[PDB]
Each structure stands twice: as C-alpha cells, then as structure tokens.
Amino acid sequence: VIGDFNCTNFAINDLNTTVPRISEYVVDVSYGLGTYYILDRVYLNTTILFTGYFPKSGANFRDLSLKGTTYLSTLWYQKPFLSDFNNGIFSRVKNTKLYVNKTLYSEFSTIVIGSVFINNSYTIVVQPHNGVLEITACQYTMCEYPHTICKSKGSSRNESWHFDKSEPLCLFKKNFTYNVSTDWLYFHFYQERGTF
C-alpha cells in the first residue's frame, strides 16, 4: 500500500513466493568503490577528511527486485519490500542486456521515494528509458498498485503508476544519460537538514 487512488484492477492475487536474498559481495572502500565525490568542487594532490553519509565497510547487501507476468500480489507492496528510508541508501544495479533482432537494449527497475505518496506532497521517481534516466521529483498522484512495463518485448499489462491529466507543480525536472554497454551502475541517495 503506497497510494490511495484506484488506477487499474485487472489481475489481483495474494501469494507469498518471494523473499529478499542476502548478497555474497562485501563492501570494499579500499580503492574508492562505495565513496562519492563531494559537491561540485575539485581537489588536487591532497588528502582530506570528510564527515558524511557513507556505508559501513564489511557489510552485506539485500535484493529488492520484483518481476511478474501480468500478476500482482498485495504483499509485494508491503514490508519488507516497502523498507524505511532512515538516513540514506547505496544501491548497486545490474545492467540487464536484451537483444531484439541483434539490437542491444538496457533496462532495470525503477525507484520511488517519498513520505506519504499523496498528491499533497512531493515524490521522487527515478526510472530509465533505453539509456536515458529521468528524475522529476514531482507531486505525482500514484496509486497503491504501481508498476512499469518493458519497451522491448512488452508485457500484457501497460505502464500505469500515476494518473495525472496535467503535469503537477514541482521544482525540479531534468534528464541524464549513461553508457548503454556497461554492466553495473551505482547510486547514492540521502538527505540532511531537509536537503535531498
């Protein structure tokens, strides 16, 4: 349960055949993996001490990827899948490569962060579109059954996670790009003193 609107109801089931798996990879910040560049500054030939939001070395990961075939369960939209954003997250994503008539396509899951996920508040949503990211962070009206379809070899359902005839009001809007031939992507998200 994330939203409150009734956007679509085609195949609603109730099954429990999923469980988050603990990864076998360990966080190694020896060569830089796990640390982030500071804000738009440049340091040259120096050694600094930075007090910030970083992950703990010697930890394990947890997977939250969900995939289905025209079937959605109510338990998928609850805990432990609907985790809590205490102070921040560091995520590693695998670049799923597909081929449609010997043409490379890249697509992975999307993330949605918010507080109550209602139209009276803001909500950040990050999703890729064939090597092009999309960060909006707008006051979207998302329903309690959000999902996303694949452009290549599409599914029976249609992409419908927000129902807004007109674009709502927000502060940020921008697109980004990335290499489509890579294999792993990394993301850092956090907030401090109300600044995300």
Partner 1 sequence: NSGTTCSNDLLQPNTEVFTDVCVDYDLYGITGQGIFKEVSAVYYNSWQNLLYDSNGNIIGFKDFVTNKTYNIFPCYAGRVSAAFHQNASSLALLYRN
Partner 2 sequence: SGFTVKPVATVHRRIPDLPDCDIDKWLNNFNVPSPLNWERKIFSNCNFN
Partner 3 sequence: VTPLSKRQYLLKFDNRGVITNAVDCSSSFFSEIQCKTKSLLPNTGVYDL
Ligand X SMILES: *[C@@H]1O[C@H](CO)[C@@H](O[C@@H]2O[C@H](CO)[C@@H](O)[C@H](O)[C@H]2NC(C)=O)[C@H](O)[C@H]1NC(C)=O
Residues that bind partner 1 (CB under 8 A): 37, 40-44, 46-48, 169-171
CA 104 to chain centre: 22
18 sits in which H/E element:
none
| Token pair 């599409």 in the structure block, residue | 154
* 70 in Cβ contact with 11 (< 8 Å): yes
Q: Does 171 bind partner 2 (CB under 8 A)?
A: yes
Which does residue 163 bind out of partner 3, ligand X, partner 1, none, counting CB within 5 to 8 angstroms by kind? none
Q: Return d(Cα 135, Cα 175) in angstroms, integer.
A: 6
Task: Choose which of 71, 81, 99, 172 interacts with partner 2 (CB under 8 A).
Answer: 172
- Shorter beta-carbon distance to partner 3: residue 22 or 171: 22
Q: How far apart are CA 160 and CA 146, in angstroms?
A: 7
How near is the Cβ of 52 to partner 1 at its closest, in Å? 15
Q: Which is nearer to partner 2, 164 or 183 (CB)?
A: 164
Among 5, 18, 27, 131, binds partner 3 (CB under 8 A): 27
Per rule CB under 8 A, count of chain residues that contact partner 3: 39
* 53 near partner 3, rule: CB under 8 A: yes
User: Which of 14, 84 has the CB closer to partner 3?
Assistant: 84
Strands 104-106 and 97-99: antiparallel
Closest to 88 in 3D by CA, of 58, 113, 51, 118? 113
User: Quick check: helix, strand or coil at residue 76?
Assistant: helix
Contacting positions for partner 2 (CB under 8 A) = 138, 166-167, 169-174
Contacting positions for ligand X (CB under 6 A) = 45, 129, 132, 134, 173, 175
